[PDB]
């Protein structure tokens, strides 16, 4: 199984699948034709099934403990689980009319699977993750400044 996942055809096939996922996601519009909604909701189901099959193949081909450490694939399992949960949640006795539009975002985040082999994006991401503590400190100070001025404005022009 490790021969296929490390091949050159598998990567491009996954690229095609994620391109199709993006195409299905970015086709909704106001007053969309009734024949396109069914296409979208069956493509979502079949592509979710195919992606979870690929994920279970990947998990039981190299190692369970060697993938949890890496953050690149750590949220992929969460995305797959959320996708597989959305289908049963919608089809069961839970309608959640706003819940449809909140579960499409986690399926949309799958586009990031194309930005793995860059060597330039990840190089900056490494430094950002290293300095995330300073980033959070600066953001929190900015938030505190905004809060103080909001309270002063409430006191003055409230």
């Amino acid at each position: 199984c490790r021969a296929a996942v490390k091949s050159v055809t598998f990567y491009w096939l996954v690229i095609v699948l994620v391109f199709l996922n993006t195409l299905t996601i970015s086709s909704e519009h106001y007053n969309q034709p009734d024949w396109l909604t069914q296409i979208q909701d069956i493509a979502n189901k079949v592509l979710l099934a195919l992606f979870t099959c690929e994920m279970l193949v990947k998990m039981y081909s190299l190692g369970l403990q060697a993938y949890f450490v890496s953050l690149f694939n750590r949220f992929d399992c969460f995305v797959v689980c959320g996708g597989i949960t959305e289908t049963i949640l919608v089809e069961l006795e839970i309608m959640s009319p706003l819940g449809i539009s909140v579960f499409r975002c986690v399926r949309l985040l799958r586009i990031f699977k194309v930005t793995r082999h860059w060597t330039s994006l990840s190089n900056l991401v490494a430094s950002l993750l290293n300095s995330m503590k300073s980033i959070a400190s600066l953001l929190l100070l900015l938030f505190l400044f905004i809060i103080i001025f909001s309270l002063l404005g409430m006191q003055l022009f409230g």
Binding site: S134, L141, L144, I147, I148, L152, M154, Q155, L156
Partner: protein, 143 residues
Amino acid sequence: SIVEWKPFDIFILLAIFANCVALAIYIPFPEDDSNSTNHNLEKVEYAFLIIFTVETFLKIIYVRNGWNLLDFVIVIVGLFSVILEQLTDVKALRAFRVLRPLRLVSGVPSLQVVLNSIIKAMVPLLHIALLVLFVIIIYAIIG
């Protein structure tokens, strides 16, 4: 006074955060209107004033440091505001309560150093500010 360092300085920081939340909940109604929430929040602010005065008098040993200077300036101006409110733009004297969230930076040195660095990175911009002042004055006179 007696040694109380690790529990005290985090309890007072939690008190600061709670005061921030209480200040955020308050709704500034127009033309002296009010509801029950502000009626409770006035007593909450009272209790915060007493606890702040108690913890300030506990550690007086203190005034020379600027942060402690602001710390007790807030307390004294709040006390004066309470006195004037009871003995009646007196309501505007509570605008100094907005500086209490600023006390939270003194409780976290990791953020205090960041604030100090940002403030110290402002001195080189004074020349540009002065140039802007001359440009504004000259163009105002020309207009």
